[PDB]
């Protein structure tokens, strides 16, 4: 009840922003809208949770301090510190059930809830551990995030598969119509392990990465995943389910390969999409010798047609696709040329960067 600390604003701002950002989603449970503050030894720990995931930040206390703990409204405390001027010294002390914040001639009195009432952390043990650059995790998530299901009745699809095996880390996401897979080497021999990170967890893991030189350290348990970057520790529950065996649906023997410029292909699909059915978004692809024709029609009987020069020397074919699924892939590919691998008009197509096998995308066609 006698916690005291003084911290410079810029050493407190990012911790508060990171731990407080995800909070406020459980309005019937007031204490989950608060941050747990703990002063012990020379460290201030800041914890916020929604019971599904948790964010912890450590702040070094260089100025005199006194041990203690409390909980305070997260966003208000963040807004106060961010509203103070650059360079401000933020003196905090507990006085009964009020937390007092002083800086210059700005004084604030916040309401508290006892630290003893804060949900005590999930106790779990790590089963797999590895380190990798932040940029590599950045790439793995961006390459597949868009293919995750949104509010699918199949809860096990509303997340991202994280797969470790040998020297490879792999992410997979699918909604049953389209699939994205991305693999990166990490340089450690790892045991074979597959876990599903919930959608919200993926986003939060995404947003704590600053690309900087700090490495990322991942610990995977049986029911939780943890990411440690610098002075931040993020923990999330795993989705307790089984991801589909995606290897079975990867096109087995695509004998027809098409290559085209990524941008020209994307700008052509994007124009044709304008006159596609606004709900079903169907477009038609006609592939012939070194030529791709894209058409679109809508209930108003309006029509678009695009003809592109491509590299294709296979059987003539027609195949329908949801143009949004196609455009999402081309937007996710940040490359010069793309390769499309086809089988027939009723089978999926595999799309990739022509110059890299790192990421692959499988899109199921439409019956147009």
């Amino acid at each position: 009840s006698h916690m005291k600390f003084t911290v410079e604003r810029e050493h407190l701002l990012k911790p508060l922003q990171q731990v407080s950002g995800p909070l406020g989603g459980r309005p019937t449970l007031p204490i989950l809208g608060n941050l747990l503050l703990q002063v012990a030894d020379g460290t201030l720990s800041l914890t916020g949770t929604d019971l599904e995931m948790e964010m912890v930040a450590r702040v070094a206390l260089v100025q005199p301090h006194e041990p203690g703990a409390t909980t305070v409204p997260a966003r208000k405390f963040f807004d106060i510190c961010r509203g103070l001027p650059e360079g401000a010294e933020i003196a905090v002390q507990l006085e009964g059930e009020r937390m007092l914040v002083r800086s210059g001639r700005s004084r604030f009195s916040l309401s508290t809830l006892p630290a003893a009432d804060f949900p005590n952390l999930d106790d779990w043990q790590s089963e797999v551990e590895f380190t990798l650059p932040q940029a590599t995790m950045k790439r793995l998530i961006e390459a597949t995030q868009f293919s995750m299901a949104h509010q699918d009745v199949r809860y096990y699809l509303n997340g991202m598969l994280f797969e470790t095996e040998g020297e490879e880390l792999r992410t997979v996401a699918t909604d049953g119509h389209r699939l994205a897979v991305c693999s990166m080497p990490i340089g450690q021999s790892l045991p074979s392990h597959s876990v599903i990170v919930p959608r919200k967890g993926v986003i939060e893991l995404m947003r704590m990465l600053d690309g900087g030189d700090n490495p990322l350290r991942v610990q995977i348990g049986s029911n939780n995943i943890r990411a440690h970057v610098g002075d931040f520790i993020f923990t999330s529950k795993l989705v307790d389910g089984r991801f589909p065996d995606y290897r079975r649906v990867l096109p087995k023997n695509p004998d027809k390969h098409l290559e085209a410029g990524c941008d020209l292909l994307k700008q052509a699909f994007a124009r044709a999409a304008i006159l596609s059915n606004e709900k079903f978004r169907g477009v038609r692809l006609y592939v012939s010798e070194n030529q791709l024709k894209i058409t679109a029609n809508n209930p108003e009987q309006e029509e678009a047609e695009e003809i592109l020069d491509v590299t294709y020397s296979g059987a003539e074919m027609e195949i329908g696709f949801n143009v949004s699924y196609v455009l999402d892939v081309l937007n996710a590919l940040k490359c010069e040329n793309v390769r499309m691998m086809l089988t027939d008009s009723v089978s999926s197509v595999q799309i990739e960067d022509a110059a890299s096998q790192s990421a692959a995308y499988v899109v199921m066609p439409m019956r147009l």
Partner: peptide, 5 residues
């Protein structure tokens, strides 16, 4: 739309 499975 056709499905992957």
């Amino acid at each position: 739309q056709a499905x992957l499975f």
